[PDB]
Design a protein around this nucleic acid. Structure first.
Ligand SMILES: NC(=[NH2+])NCCC[C@H](N)C(=O)O
Ligand SMILES: NC(=[NH2+])NCCC[C@H](N)C(=O)O
Ligand SMILES: NC(=[NH2+])NCCC[C@H](N)C(=O)O
Ligand SMILES: NC(=[NH2+])NCCC[C@H](N)C(=O)O
Ligand SMILES: NC(=[NH2+])NCCC[C@H](N)C(=O)O
Ligand SMILES: NC(=[NH2+])NCCC[C@H](N)C(=O)O
Lengths: 149, 154, 155, 149, 155, 149
DNA sequence: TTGCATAACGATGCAA
DNA sequence: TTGCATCGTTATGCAA
DNA sequence: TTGCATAACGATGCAA
DNA sequence: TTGCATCGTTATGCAA
DNA sequence: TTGCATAACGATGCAA
DNA sequence: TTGCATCGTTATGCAA
């Protein structure tokens, strides 16, 4: 559940990372992070945003683009609830376990939250390395994920 | 007819201990009905009959679940796939024997893995990239039929 | 007074009036003598690359055709960027049935494939990148060979 | 070469990570980690395990599932023999090189061995990062892999 | 004096003379009586596995057919290595249309697929590896089923 | 722009990592790292190298192979110019950001440069972890990449 | 216990 | 939709 | 602001 | 190449 | 040494 | 299975 402004920020973010051909598709992309709105609302959002359905010559039907921290943290905490199997740490690294295939998904949500204490993440398949920004330790990071769980 | 023979079968199974299809044939014959092993294989396949046994339990006997599950093994490979399709299938498209499923960025592997686990008879295999999954349809299913099958769970 | 001529009438009408719907462009062309249905306008605008434009809070757009000078701040160089990376990274092409197979230097397939996706080609249903190989699925009735030749001609 | 009990533990592990449609297929999966048995033996294993060939309605032919450290270390040492090109280290990380494409394969075998001194692994393509559990260092880890080689 | 016999003449002529071109092998076979065009020689050399060899700074090669004893230092065991890993890692095969689908243990698909690419099979247009699955695209008119059976027979 | 000898070393490297079926293809692979030569030159290179177009029985048309630090650093610096969005660090790790999909590409170029202070790299999608060799820190590595940029 | 050889069982392309 | 014929898959008697 | 119901608008398979 | 018929996609009047 | 233009060489769809 | 005709691929004479 997010307000007009929060939802639109997410829309802008979605439109840059995905090729969105229709408003129904945009609604599915938002529902994946727990934002449920109808098509009417998205028509209004995209208009307020100045989003245009852009295509070149012989370019088919078009995809929406809007011309020119994220918060953000809620998407992540949502996914942590769902995909975080375990945490552990060593030195400046937290190590997170997710179900198989889920690591890139969780890690991308972590990146987008832009935590001040996270230098970066790398996802394999069911594992994520989270690099702690000094002097934060991996143990503290792990503590932060266990708390936001 | 068919739907009626299958009712005879659901009934015979949950009241006797059938260990082979030929055995179910002779049982249905005594009750009047004449079908071959071929047809029983087809019916049990449609019914979702499974040959069951516990640890050291020998050759199983056929049982059809009543949407109440198998003992501890979740036949919700399918239920889990449907749930993740509901959460993550963004759109579908197709070409020839291929269905192409789109997901949010980074989620394709997670969905594709749930699809593999469900072991659909009409899927030969899947490949996940980052936001795209290619699903190969088993002849004579087309990519379009397979896509619509995934759409109807979206 | 054929197609290429009607499309010149259209480029002209658009950049001098404010057309908000295809039916509206139909009646405009009718006054100027020409009779075409909405179907045909949809096809022409698609070929012209006409886009319905508006700014922030700008309502229902009006049609405009770029003159290879871009859209305002949104780079219609999804295609230009794809062509540049094809130039840099497409090593060879091949095909089978509905599939084009593109080869790149080792490790570059994801980076190229991502630029192809962003370009959102009408004839591409999707792509999958491995490490040095990209599979591109052609939209019927385009064949993998036509799609490969299309990528070759940018190589 | 493993005994009835070791082989069956491996079978249970295989059945959860793969979709196994036939006993011949199960034999190939076991041969990949150097366990060679015949189909007769697998029929007997699967029976002792209570494994059932499960399918839903209109669900085709079925895949085997059994209802409800791994050792483990031998699978890994086997693969180390085969895929370990070099080791190196820095701080709390061992860095392992494998031939191209082999890294996920080796790393998954390392994960399943559940070494008490390994917090986790991440595989790229020909490289694996192994995170040492404090106070073990990466150098020691590298020493441990060079020993099990 | 059929195909298998002409190819024996060729294995013989090659390992006793220095043939630098197919036309050259044609005239050599003509002197020995046999009449074939360059087209046919190209086909035979292809089947024989004749390779045009030279060392460093060695110019235009001469044709040689290995006797299952390898090429000098370059392992023609791209194929041997693929067969070995197929034996180790191919768990099952299946097919659809122009695609063979190979299954491996979890995490091994890239390692197998890489060995298959290196072998550079004439009937493979390319491969894509996921985690436990590899998709192999058959070159028309080979089908996915033929390609799968070819991998099966090495399993 | 590289000399006969530098170009040929790159050729040898390319022929082992790719399946090269034709000289035109080899030219595209070299152009991707900014080396532009014609087919005539490559015919001469491959001859000097003793490269042969190798195939087995019924083996089709053949691929080129040559029988039996890289510098190297220039390929990398070129790509750094093009793909390095940002650098950051923690302890013994430098963290590099590239555009999406570009990480494996940049990282492989980093591996091939074989920098004495780099123990190894792992690439995700838009991120690379670079492991610094003790006592070099990640901050210094980051400084080195910011310099070669 | 295990392999082998083989029997019992189940699935499926084809034609009706 | 079914049966036939057949083939792939799984179970099991005996030797070791 | 939002959802709903529905109207307005655009795209496309088919047949000519 | 176009129009027809139709369907998918997007915009918007009203109740809350 | 390199590029260019072009010659020599090899591969392949098609029809017999 | 082959030859024809042709095209893609590789080698090389000359200018710079
Ligand atoms: N199926 C696999 N790729 N397994 C390898 C896992 C290795 C490591 N834990 C990672 O997630 O990167
Ligand atoms: N972050 C990325 N790699 N994006 C590119 C995606 C390319 C292609 N659609 C795939 O899924 O394989
Ligand atoms: N380094 C590797 N993973 N090589 C394997 C490549 C296999 C296949 N061509 C792909 O690109 O997916
Ligand atoms: N084919 C490649 N992507 N090679 C680059 C490997 C880069 C890095 N060492 C990794 O394994 O992730
Ligand atoms: N982590 C997994 N087990 N993924 C399984 C599904 C992935 C899909 N078959 C692929 O190879 O890309
Ligand atoms: N598109 C994605 N898979 N994003 C998740 C990966 C995020 C992480 N920084 C990495 O590159 O591994």
């Amino acid at each position: 559940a997010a307000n007009r402004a929060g939802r639109q920020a997410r829309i802008v973010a979605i439109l840059s990372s995905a090729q969105v051909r229709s408003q129904n598709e945009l609604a599915a992309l938002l529902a994946a992070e727990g934002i449920e709105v109808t098509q009417a609302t998205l028509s209004r959002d995209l208009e307020e945003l100045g989003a245009v359905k852009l295509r070149g010559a012989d370019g088919g039907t078009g995809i929406y683009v809007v011309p020119e921290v994220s918060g953000g943290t809620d998407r992540m905490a949502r996914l942590l609830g769902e995909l975080l199997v375990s945490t552990d740490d060593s030195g400046n690294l937290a190590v997170l376990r997710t179900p198989p295939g889920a690591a890139h998904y969780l890690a991308s949500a972590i990146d987008r939250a832009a935590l001040p204490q996270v230098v970066g993440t790398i996802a394999g398949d069911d594992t994520i390395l989270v690099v702690a920004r000094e002097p934060t330790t991996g143990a503290q990071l792990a503590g932060m994920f266990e708390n936001l769980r």
